[PDB]
């Protein structure tokens, strides 16, 4: 099952990696999301949510 979309379930190491990938690729593709899912050991849906919310936050903070 997926995790709550508004809850953080990641470590500082996991968030660091997720942030790094975001900076490089803002919209992970099929295979990238798959690998990301393996990195966090959670459904791909969880990756999609994180990057979707992170992208929204980016746009809000974008100047």
Curated annotation (Swiss-Prot):
Q: What does the record give as the DNA-binding region? A: 3-62
Subcellular localization: Nucleus
Which tissues is this chain's protein expressed in?
Expressed in neuroblastoma, brain and adrenal gland.
Family classification: Belongs to the paired homeobox family.
- Give the function comment from the record: Involved in the development of several major noradrenergic neuron populations, including the locus coeruleus. Transcription factor which could determine a neurotransmitter phenotype in vertebrates. Enhances second-messenger-mediated activation of the dopamine beta-hydrolase and c-fos promoters, and of several enhancers including cAMP-response element and serum-response element.
* Subunit description: Interacts with TRIM11.
Identify the disorder associated with this protein: Central hypoventilation syndrome, congenital, 1: An autosomal dominant form of congenital central hypoventilation syndrome, a rare disorder characterized by abnormal control of respiration in the absence of neuromuscular or lung disease, or an identifiable brain stem lesion. A deficiency in autonomic control of respiration results in inadequate or negligible ventilatory and arousal responses to hypercapnia and hypoxemia.
Protein's UniProt name: Paired mesoderm homeobox protein 2B
Give the organism the record lists: Homo sapiens (Human)
Q: What is the lineage of its organism?
A: Eukaryota, Metazoa, Chordata, Craniata, Vertebrata
